[PDB]
Amino acid sequence: VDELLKGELVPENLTEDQKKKKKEIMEQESLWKNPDFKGYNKTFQELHQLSKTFANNQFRLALSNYQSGVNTIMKNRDWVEQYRKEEAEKKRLDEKWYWQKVDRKAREERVVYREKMKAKQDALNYFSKAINHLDEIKNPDLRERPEFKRLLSDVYRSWIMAEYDLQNLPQTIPILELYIEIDDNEKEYPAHKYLASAYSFEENMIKKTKGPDDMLFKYRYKKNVHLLRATELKYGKDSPEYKHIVNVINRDEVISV
């Protein structure tokens, strides 16, 4: 069931009485046909924001950007694999010491790391444009369609993964909490694995900069909740990994005896 197979949000074309209304309105617009008309009051023309054609174009705009952002990530992975292949095949006629190999090997790691972060940044800009297009659809009826929920979760997942590689952990928390509220995404353990790390970053910063204890507990409480939930979804309840995490969480939090 590929909800994005047809590449649109909602299909478009029944009652004879309704078809009678469509006839007279089209006749009315023909009398008042003025292609140069621009409305001083935008309230009436803003009703087009609720139309299915409007939402269709917004979805196809967001879909257009999402494919661009995934392309940057995937084309980069191809380059890194190809880049390493070429280096091993060229002749090193001026290397007769082990330390020279480490120096040559160290350069490749930096070249690889340099291109990855460049590619990650391009994807995030592409993903961010797609997010704004999705959020300017004002009809809740069309926002519940399986086509919308498929791309909305797909966009957030790609945005979060790119953001975490750029080490912008605190920005993933607001997006991830919206991600796990769509369909059965809350049952995905990676979604709670990322929030386990992201909330740990928040706790460390509050600890480092010596913020309030209330915010310290909140980030610690959220960190343990999603650390446990991620453990349960992957290793199952009452499992040896689950028992270990509960011991860690019990030590990490406060218990009143």
Next chain:
Amino acid sequence: VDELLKGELVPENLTEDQKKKKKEIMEQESLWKNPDFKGYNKTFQELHQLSKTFANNQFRLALSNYQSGVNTIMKNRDWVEQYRKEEAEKKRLDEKWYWQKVDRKAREERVVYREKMKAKQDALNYFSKAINHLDEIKNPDLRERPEFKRLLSDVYRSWIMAEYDLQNLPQTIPILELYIEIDDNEKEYPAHKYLASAYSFEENMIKKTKGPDDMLFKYRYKKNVHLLRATELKYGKDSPEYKHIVNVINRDEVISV
């Protein structure tokens, strides 16, 4: 018992003798019908201010402005509630440090606070016009009708709450004293609560500017009179809160052993 149900001050519409009298007066005006007549001596025409038709229009002029003033307050609260909801529901994709969240909240409060004072001033302008309209009703018999008191109490009460939020406490003292003379309005503890703060401000200004000790003691006396009344009205005598205020007042006030 909605006194303002019909939206009028006095009902406007029986003796056979009075019916005969009205007939001949209507006949007299018919002979002397001259719409262009402008009286040089305004004294006789001003007797219209003592009629019931005059009071009906003045009452509905004050009622019209009261609704505009009340609508200004109500629309502002809805805007602030909607504004806070919208801000929390958008994405802060460039916000990874807790001090950015503090800065973001500060801007929202500055916007929210600014809109309130702008709404209070516009609402206050409408309330004062209603006050002017009610004070040009020159019939004491019509002033004592239950419809008049119901509107006058609402106009005075709304003005005091709007002007207090603009930090103009001394202006509210004469209005509150007008307010507590209408039926059982003195049996409201919030009315005496406002007077307790308003007289406290007056005493501080005398103390700060080193004014007369006579004015210092008068505002102190008025402050303690209404402070104790609101304590009794809301918490009652022989209550722990009521005994607290007596200790506070006795500590503040001058006692002659």
Next chain:
Amino acid sequence: AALGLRNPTVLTFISLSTAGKANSVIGLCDDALRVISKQRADLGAYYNRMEHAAKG
């Protein structure tokens, strides 16, 4: 944002708190300087032309 010192979508600006980041900012400032330098050349050319027209 127009000078390349900020992202016109994310709205994050350049940072120097890491040695690796700071080295790539040198190129960012080189581009930013050329953008400012170019625009002043355009403004300077407009003034010189208008000066001839006012003289004429």
Next chain:
Amino acid sequence: SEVNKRLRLHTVLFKMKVRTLPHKTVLYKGKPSADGERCEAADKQEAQDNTCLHLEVFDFVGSEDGKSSKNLGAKFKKMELFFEGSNNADPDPRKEQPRNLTKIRTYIYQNNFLLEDKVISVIADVAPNGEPAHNDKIELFYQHDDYPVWGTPETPSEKGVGKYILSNVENTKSNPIRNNFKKQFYFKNLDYFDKLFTKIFDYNDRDSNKHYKKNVEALKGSLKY
């Protein structure tokens, strides 16, 4: 026109509490008074025994010049709807079938203080439903400066002055008075109040929706800890 049937749908207002009204608009329910000429206020506005709607809109003389505060006069136009029969036993106003209309009354008032000119026009349609053309059951009252006294019928020797019915009005091709009365005023007069009656119901019903959302929203605040 079938606009009179639309006024029958406004029987849901009896069991609906009125908490939102337009600016300078008065609406209350009651029972017919003596002679059934007008409506009398009810102490309990939510009682089922009430059968009369009272809707009134008022303005000020000279409001087109921006001189409302100058107190040049007063004006109000009110429509009172009369039904027959008691209301449904259930206290839910959302489900309520349209009821028959005993009579439709339109009242027009205007009093100009500077010119001492007062006009009172009263229209009572005692057969709103039953026949599209019922001109003999459309009582019109026209008082101009307290003349004629209330309850004075239009004499045949002095036509147009006082209480009269629309049948006596001529509708010749030379003077299409009946055509103009309905085409210009009466049709728009009924249409105006019809939207206003529906507007008031939709607003008050909308209010009950917000309170339900308020309780659910406040409950979500318990999920933050």
